[PDB]
């Protein structure tokens, strides 16, 4: 009643506060600040449940509705680009503050066990939370064409502006916020369409609510509204040459999620559109060149896990892995970025191209891999180097297994002596060399993160052995002794360019039963002994399945009213021991399967070597006896 009905006065005041930019931005900031709870950034949604109960209003929805209507329609009356950028940034921040304040796991567990197991008392609380929280309205607005059009217009800008702009420029911050909102929407679209739409529809059908739809029924998902924009990927790729770590990581994650989808790649390749869009003015070439220049940039030894360069490298590697693992038979953008001529159900190399001159992304990866040393002195056997090489080897294996990109890759590898570089980069493992300053025999080893690096190193050795065996089989079937001599010399322990290297029998040091990975010390467990891991269990024992059971048991014991305060610490320490027991069992299973895979790879390599061997046997009798001596204790 601002001094005329309230439904009219409120909209009149909102429209009055919409004229201009200063007052609009100030109101948006005020609303964003008010939406923050007093405890800071989970229940008790930050607003009174009786907000607007007197008048026939939907609560706090009108505010978000007006904000979205403004951001969608009145963005053309702003001449000053700075004001428009500030308004878009404020709207994106408001949307993010509204989305981040939504419970996902809570609603999932509710819809799962509340009505099916728990009573019907708390159901009303979750219902009111889902009905009053503005997340549903934001998601509904996200399916509008105006919103995505404004977003892609804001993200589509000239490169000169971003180049001459400052890292703290509002344009970069707005683009980052928009990418984050898009990521959150792509993550929560399924949860929404599953546990919001039906409940809201049922409530609207039962009770009396007057709401105006703002979503498009045709857009069954968020990808339907964005699959019509081809310049988005081009802009995301061009924005990688700016140097901004956060923006680069966001763009890489967005491209990875896009390549991971299915409808987008079904619409693109039902000839194709992306390959021709990225080959308009040589965008792929410059993108590959920028990626190569980036991965070649060194890292900061002190800021191992904080070096933005290493983070960008890992993001690019994850993107390539996800793009190659998805739909390997049909080519993708990864093949074009590597320097291949992506043709319909066929690949090829062009003359004088970047991949022909051995200057491309794949060759850059090969170089940075062969010029990488993991053997250190101060710590020795670092972890992040191991992770990097493991990712590189996974990408190489994904490229090799694909028969569409196997022959050319094997040719390019054998034409540069990659196996020789790998062997020269090999390092022997012993129980004395610690992992990141920590010894293996220590009990904390199974609890520390060194297990991941150990599994990665085992997988790397297995992949190297498999590649060596495949190359040996190829050279044998090709009936050419020009390379067989060098292969045997490398296996004999000599190199003629003589440089010596440890033989294959030297690397047979990963089979050791002294650690007793199978045996586990079982504590007394005077209580909770009957709690098994039935619902916990692909050997993967979930911890929540036992956490809920032990919590229910503790609640029952407390309700029994028999020395509940004293014996609580016993149950607490038993749970703290059981969680580490489960983690140790999982790590032991992982180590066991890794050792099994490595042993299988080594056995296959040895079989391929023994079978395809025309060299005399009397000289190799020494190696035969050595292998027999080495396997004797293993069999025993």
């Amino acid at each position: 009643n601002p001094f005329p009905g309230p439904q009219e006065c409120m909209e009149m005041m909102f429209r009055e506060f919409g004229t201009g930019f200063e007052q609009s931005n100030a109101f948006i900031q005020l609303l964003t600040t008010l939406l923050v709870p007093p405890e800071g950034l989970n229940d008790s949604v930050p607003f009174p449940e009786w907000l607007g109960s007197s008048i026939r209003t939907l609560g706090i929805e009108p505010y978000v509705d007006f904000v979205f209507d403004v951001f969608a329609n009145r963005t053309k009356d702003i001449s000053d680009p700075s004001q428009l950028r500030i308004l878009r940034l404020s709207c994106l921040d408001f949307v993010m503050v509204c989305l981040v304040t939504f419970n996902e796991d809570l609603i999932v567990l509710g819809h799962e066990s509340n009505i099916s197991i728990d009573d019907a008392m708390a159901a009303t609380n979750l219902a009111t939370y889902v009905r009053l929280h503005p997340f549903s309205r934001v998601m509904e607005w996200l399916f509008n064409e105006k919103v995505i059009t404004s977003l892609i217009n804001t993200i589509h800008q000239d490169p000169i502006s971003l180049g001459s702009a400052s890292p703290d420029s509002p344009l970069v911050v707005s683009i980052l916020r928009a990418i984050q909102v898009m990521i959150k929407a792509l993550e929560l679209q399924e949860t929404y369409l599953h546990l919001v739409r039906p409940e809201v529809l049922r409530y609207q059908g039962e009770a009396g609510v007057r709401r105006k739809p703002v979503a498009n029924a045709a857009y069954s998902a968020f990808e339907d509204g964005i699959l019509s924009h081809l310049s988005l990927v081009v802009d995301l790729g061009k924005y990688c040459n700016l140097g901004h770590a956060e923006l680069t990581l966001a763009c890489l994650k967005l491209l990875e999620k896009i390549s991971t989808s299915s409808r987008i790649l079904s619409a693109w390749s039902p000839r194709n559109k992306a390959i021709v869009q990225l080959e308009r003015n040589g965008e792929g070439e410059t993108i590959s060149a920028s990626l190569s220049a980036s991965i070649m940039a060194t890292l900061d030894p002190a800021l191992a896990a904080s070096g933005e360069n290493y983070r960008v490298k890992l993001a690019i590697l994850d993107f390539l892995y996800a793009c190659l693992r998805a739909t390997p038979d049909q080519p993708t953008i990864a093949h074009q970025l590597l320097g291949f001529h992506c043709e319909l159900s066929k690949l090829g190399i062009e003359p004088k191209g970047p991949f022909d001159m051995q200057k491309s992304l794949f060759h850059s990866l090969l170089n940075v891999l062969i010029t990488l040393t993991v053997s250190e002195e101060e710590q020795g056997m670092r972890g992040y180097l191991v992770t990097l090489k493991y990712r590189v080897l996974r990408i190489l294996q994904l490229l090799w297994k694909s028969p569409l990109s196997a022959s050319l890759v094997m040719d390019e590898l054998r034409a540069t002596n990659f196996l020789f570089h790998m062997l020269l980069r090999e390092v022997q493992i012993q129980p004395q060399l610690p992992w990141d300053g920590q010894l293996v025999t220590g009990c904390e080893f199974l609890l520390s993160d060194a297990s991941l690096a150990y599994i990665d190193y085992l997988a790397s050795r297995a992949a190297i052995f498999e590649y060596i065996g495949k190359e040996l089989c190829s050279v044998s079937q090709n009936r050419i002794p020009s390379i067989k001599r060098q292969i045997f010399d490398a296996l004999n322990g000599q190199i003629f360019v003589p440089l010596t290297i440890p033989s294959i029998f030297d690397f047979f040091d990963f089979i050791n039963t002294d650690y007793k990975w199978e045996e586990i010390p079982s504590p007394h467990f005077t209580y909770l002994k009957d709690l098994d891991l039935g619902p916990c269990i692909g050997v993967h024992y979930d911890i929540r399945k036992a956490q809920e059971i032990l919590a229910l048991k503790r609640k029952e014991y407390e309700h029994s009213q028999l020395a509940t305060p004293e014996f609580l610490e016993t149950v607490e320490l038993e749970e703290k021991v059981l969680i580490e027991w489960l983690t140790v069992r999982n790590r032991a299973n992982l180590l066991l399967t890794a050792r099994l895979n490595l042993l299988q790879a080594w056995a296959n390599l040895l079989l391929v070597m023994i079978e395809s061997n025309d060299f005399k046997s009397t000289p190799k009798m020494a190696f035969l006896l050595q292998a027999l001596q080495a396997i004797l204790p293993t069999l025993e």
Binding site: Q358, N367, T416, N417, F420, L424, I495, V497, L499
Partner: peptide
Amino acid sequence: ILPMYKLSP
């Protein structure tokens, strides 16, 4: 063609 890929330590 192989400026640095050579095995010349």
